Design a protein around this ligand. Structure first.
Ligand SMILES: O=C(O)CNC(=O)c1ncc(-c2cccc(Cl)c2)cc1O
Ligand SMILES: [Mn+2]
Length: 222
């Protein structure tokens, strides 16, 4: 689908009604697989961190580490289909802008590529932006071929604020997810028992970000 049709007919209505939006088959199989290939090359060539420290034992040979990450700008050698994904996410947001609540989105982070190594680690319940650091929208792309959570775990579970229910999102190949980054969407990743990849970017609201400058300390000489 053309970005604008997806934006006006799906992302804008879903985001304003539910604060969560899932688009399946975002880029198609060829491109999705190429992204899988590039992420796997990053992993295989040692570009990820070792992983979040999950269990600190007094013996460090038995430390457990979880999600591994690497920040990707999209123009690096071997990351160009990742850059293509980032640009397609941006096209969608650009065609939403002015219609996502009353936010005015004026930028985004680099891509955070995540690798859950499959050792029973997940990601604890959290809010992405709990303290007003400028990020208003979380965008995640999943590239896990034939993922079956009943077998491999790794569900993303969101707990929309105020609701007595949660939303389980499988990290399915070629799946695109949007949700409000703030306290309306606490979420977690349940333990993953197979290698699980995701690519996240966060979009900034202009006003909040302009205040996060001072809430986060920048100076100029006299
Ligand atoms: O993988 C999924 O399906 C869901 N992942 C997350 O929700 C997540 N959220 C936040 C973070 C994160 C939180 C703080 C700092 C940094 Cl660099 C990353 C990582 C994360 O992996
Ligand atoms: Mn998160």
């Amino acid at each position: 689908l053309p970005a604008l049709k997806l934006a006006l007919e799906y992302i804008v209505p879903c985001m304003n009604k539910h604060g969560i939006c899932v688009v399946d088959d975002f880029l198609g199989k060829e491109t999705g697989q190429q992204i899988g290939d590039e992420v796997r090359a990053l992993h295989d060539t040692g570009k990820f961190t070792d992983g979040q420290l999950v269990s600190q034992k007094s013996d460090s040979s038995k430390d457990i580490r979880g999600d591994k990450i690497t920040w990707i700008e999209g123009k690096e050698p071997g990351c160009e289909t990742i850059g293509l994904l980032m640009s397609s996410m941006d096209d969608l947001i650009r065609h939403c802008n002015g219609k996502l609540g009353s936010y005015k989105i004026n930028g985004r982070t680099k891509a955070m590529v995540a690798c859950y190594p499959g050792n029973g680690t997940g990601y604890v319940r959290h809010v992405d932006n709990p303290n007003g650091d400028g990020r208003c929208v979380t965008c995640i792309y999943y590239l896990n071929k034939d993922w079956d959570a009943k077998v491999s775990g790794g569900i993303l579970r969101i707990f929309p604020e105020g609701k007595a229910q949660f939303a389980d999102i499988e990290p399915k190949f070629d799946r695109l997810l949007f949700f409000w980054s703030d306290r309306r969407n606490p979420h977690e990743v349940q333990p993953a028992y197979a290698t699980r990849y995701a690519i996240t970017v966060w979009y900034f609201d202009a006003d909040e970000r302009a205040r996060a400058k001072v809430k986060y300390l920048k100076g100029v000489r006299v």
